[PDB]
């Protein structure tokens, strides 16, 4: 699925990520502008590290899912399968446990390079009254 990039905003507000972890709802949908072009189907085999990058947030087999072609963490307890599928709301969940940790969105090397310190006020100006 590729979602357009209002339709993200709704899903990631109805899924109580305004705010979530110190982020705007802005910040989230840029991350996944950046990291997927909004598709839940993107797929980075080898990441700089090494890992593979997953989905809509390009989440990565070394510490937050798990495939069977190297060790994991598996700190969001789910097959990376899972993170290439229609539905976010699992993506959603591990990206909450992603952010938690001491990197926040920094985790993110494309809302680094993209996102970060940017002025993302008219971001969502079509996606809300
Ligand atoms: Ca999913």
Request: net charge positive; hydrophobic share 35%; glycine share 6%.
């Amino acid at each position: 699925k590729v979602f357009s990039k209002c339709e993200l905003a709704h899903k990631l507000k109805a899924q109580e990520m305004d705010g979530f972890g110190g982020y705007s709802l802005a910040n989230w949908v840029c991350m996944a502008e950046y990291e997927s072009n909004f598709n839940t189907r993107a797929f980075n085999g080898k990441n700089a590290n090494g890992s593979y990058d997953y989905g809509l947030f390009q989440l990565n087999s070394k510490w937050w899912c798990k495939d069977n072609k190297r060790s994991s963490s598996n700190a969001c307890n789910i097959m990376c399968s899972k993170l290439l599928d229609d539905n976010i709301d699992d993506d959603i969940s591990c990206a909450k446990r992603v952010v938690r940790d001491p990197k926040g969105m920094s985790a993110w090397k494309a809302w680094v390079k993209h996102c970060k310190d940017k002025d993302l006020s008219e971001y969502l100006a079509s996606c809300n009254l």
